[PDB]
Amino acid sequence: PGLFPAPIHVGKYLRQKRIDFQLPYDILWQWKHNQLYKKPDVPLYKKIRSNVYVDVKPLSGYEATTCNCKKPDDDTRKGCVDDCLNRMIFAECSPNTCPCGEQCCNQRIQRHEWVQCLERFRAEEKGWGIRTKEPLKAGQFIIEYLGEVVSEQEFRNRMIEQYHNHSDHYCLNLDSGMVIDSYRMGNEARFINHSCDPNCEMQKWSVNGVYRIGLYALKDMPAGTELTYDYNQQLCKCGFEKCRGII
Amino acid sequence: VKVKIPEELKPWLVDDWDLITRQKQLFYLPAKKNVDSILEDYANYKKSKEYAVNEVVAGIKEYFNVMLGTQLLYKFERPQYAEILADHPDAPMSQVYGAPHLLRLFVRIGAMLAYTPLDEKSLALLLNYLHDFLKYLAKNSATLFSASDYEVAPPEYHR
Numbered sequence: 001p002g003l004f005p006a007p008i009h010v011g012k013y014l015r016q017k018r019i020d021f022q023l024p025y026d027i028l029w030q031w032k033h034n035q036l037y038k039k040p041d042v043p044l045y046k047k048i049r050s051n052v053y054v055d056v057k058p059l060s061g062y063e064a065t066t067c068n069c070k071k072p073d074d075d076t077r078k079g080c081v082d083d084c085l086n087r088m089i090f091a092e093c094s095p096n097t098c099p100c101g102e103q104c105c106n107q108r109i110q111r112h113e114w115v116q117c118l119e120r121f122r123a124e125e126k127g128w129g130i131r132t133k134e135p136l137k138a139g140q141f142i143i144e145y146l147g148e149v150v151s152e153q154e155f156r157n158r159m160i161e162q163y164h165n166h167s168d169h170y171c172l173n174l175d176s177g178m179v180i181d182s183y184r185m186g187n188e189a190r191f192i193n194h195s196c197d198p199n200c201e202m203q204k205w206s207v208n209g210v211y212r213i214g215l216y217a218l219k220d221m222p223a224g225t226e227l228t229y230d231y232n233q234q235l236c237k238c239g240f241e242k243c244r245g246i247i
Numbered sequence: 248v249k250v251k252i253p254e255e256l257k258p259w260l261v262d263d264w265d266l267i268t269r270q271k272q273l274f275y276l277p278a279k280k281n282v283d284s285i286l287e288d289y290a291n292y293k294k295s296k297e298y299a300v301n302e303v304v305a306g307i308k309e310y311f312n313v314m315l316g317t318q319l320l321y322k323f324e325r326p327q328y329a330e331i332l333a334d335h336p337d338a339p340m341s342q343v344y345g346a347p348h349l350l351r352l353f354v355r356i357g358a359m360l361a362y363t364p365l366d367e368k369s370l371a372l373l374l375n376y377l378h379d380f381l382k383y384l385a386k387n388s389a390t391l392f393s394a395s396d397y398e399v400a401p402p403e404y405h406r
């Protein structure tokens with residue numbers, strides 16, 4: 001054999017078949033889009049690895065104390081799985097108090113255990129989107145939503161003064177008065193699109209005394225799947241039976 | 248078999264289509280940076296598993312040398328191709344053509360890979376090496392893919 005052998009039987013015939021080259025439409029659509037509107041610029045923003053507090057600090061008031069989680073003797077399996085009491089009150093364990101030590105898997109946000117297989121791509125009528133290059137399983141922690149933590153007063157000021165020339169909109173509600181604004185600063189999570197039938201969801205966790213938002217998989221996804229969540233006036237192009245029509 | 252074209256390289260495929268199909272331009276032949284040079288550069292980038300990389304390079308060369316004149320040309324490019332064959336016979340296509348057409352190769356090779364006499368593990372290994380080479384192309388996209396390698400076809404060419 002070989003590592004890269006030639007095709008046999010009908011593969012030889014197809015390989016030697018004369019066919020005028022055609023660019024596939026899942027690439028060529030970009031050209032018509034670039035003629036109707038402009039070729040999209042590289043989306044620029046300040047990449048940060050942790051939230052930036054502007055005029056508020058999203059304290060949760062909760063000190064994560066120890067659970068009754070059992071430390072597995074086999075160092076192969078992780079410690080704080082689905083029945084962790086801290087995990088059940090949506091608090092990540094503290095490293096100083098967790099009985100599972102460095103085997104605890106209830107420290108995913110604070111250990112920045114982001115999924116490393118995400119890729120920004122161009123979606124036909126939705127602009128920039130995020131897809132996963134590998135499969136994901138339900139409940140998997142994917143990424144943290146990062147940005148500037150501002151008050152609703154600060155966010156309204158920003159919208160009045162500099163977000164008037166903007167056709168998108170980059171913010172999560174961390175609170176009824178606090179917002180994570182990723183217009184200027186954030187991470188790749190700012191490119192994740194809305195869906196009326198999402199495969200991911202945002203969860204608010206208390207991580208060592210502060211609130212942090214993480215994107216977790218709602219269901220299993222194969223490779224090449226675009227990440228979506230429910231944003232909770234734009235026409236919605238999510239393409240799903242029983243679509244709400246508007247984001 | 249799905250070969251994944253790097254997302255960064257798709258706008259270049261659009262540009263290539265625009266240059267050849269709309270603007271009636273032609274890639275400079277013989278290529279100043281031919282497919283053989285690019286494969287040699289990738290093989291050296293890997294050795295900086297050697298028999299494996301060389302097998303991938305040889306296979307890409309063989310597939311390209313069969314597929315360039317059959318499936319990798321826009322219709323507007325057919326005369327030039329004929330010209331090349333007349334001007335430099337017995338020169339393989341991997342020595343005459345360059346980066347845009349080698350990239351075009353991966354748009355169509357996946358259909359052929361479904362008929363290779365390999366099992367699942369070896370086919371996965373081959374796809375691994377192919378995607379590795381494709382992301383190598385994506386890394387060096389600034390030097391490899393450029394409209395400056397294209398020129399307006401003379402009025403003689405249009406007949």
Ligand SMILES: C[S@@+](CC[C@H](N)C(=O)[O-])C[C@H]1O[C@@H](n2cnc3c(N)ncnc32)[C@H](O)[C@@H]1O
Nearest residue numbers: 126127128168169190191192193194236237238
């Ligand atoms: C947080 S941004 C997401 C990234 C955006 N696609 C981009 O190009 O930067 C949200 C914006 O994307 C667009 N968008 C997100 N989901 C959409 C959807 N399901 N249908 C149509 N547009 C959507 C809307 O214009 C919205 O203002």
Ligand SMILES: [Zn+2]
Nearest residue numbers: 067069080084
């Ligand atoms: Zn626990």
Ligand SMILES: [Zn+2]
Nearest residue numbers: 080093098104
């Ligand atoms: Zn724990």
Ligand SMILES: [Zn+2]
Nearest residue numbers: 196236238243
């Ligand atoms: Zn929808």
